[PDB]
Design a binder for this molecule. Structure first.
Ligand SMILES: [Mg+2]
Lengths: 109, 110
């Protein structure tokens, strides 16, 4: 309850502190985290209609679901997002037991 | 980057570790965080179409937007949701400078 408060505060501080675009998905491919730089890249003003969407709705060429399926990181992937060429790094997220529970893309210009 | 991986892992752990339903919104009333228990109570299988939705489209009687306006915690509100009766405690979430950046409801089984 207060513990959820502090987590939400640290979440927002980390996302805001990262200059690159961040998009995280869960195991089913739903976007669960996104920072302001990624929303700008995708052409959105805020999290409404972006969080809780399948990643392939907003990024049809995303390899984040392949990172979930394989557990394999992918680095230095060029891709086009809204007429801009960006470089994507994609890493799996694991729980304490080593199960892949999501994946993150980092986009830089 | 690695930091986001660790944060995601700690979030998931902490969201499962709470037995109450959790729903969190940002200052615009958009759902930004939810746990398995709140999803089950809402009648959803996953975060899809729950995250990123304005709170009153899923919880019409929610006072979470009231908490954003007033900056003030609200306790002991009885609620029907999954045809289940629950008690909602609602607090504001502040950044390190004490500005309100969101609000969270805890749902306790009556
Ligand atoms: Mg490419």
């Amino acid at each position: 309850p207060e513990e959820i408060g502090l987590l939400y505060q640290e979440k927002q501080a980390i996302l805001e502190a990262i200059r690159e675009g961040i998009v995280a998905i869960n195991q089913e491919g739903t976007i669960t985290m996104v920072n302001q730089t990624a929303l700008k890249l995708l052409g959105y003003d805020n999290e409404r209609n972006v969080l809780g969407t399948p990643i392939l709705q907003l990024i049809p060429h995303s390899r984040l679901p392949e990172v979930i399926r394989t557990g394999q990181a992918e680095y230095d992937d060029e891709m086009v997002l809204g007429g801009e060429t960006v470089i994507a790094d994609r890493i799996p997220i694991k729980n304490k037991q080593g199960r892949v529970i999501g994946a993150v893309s980092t986009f830089r210009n």
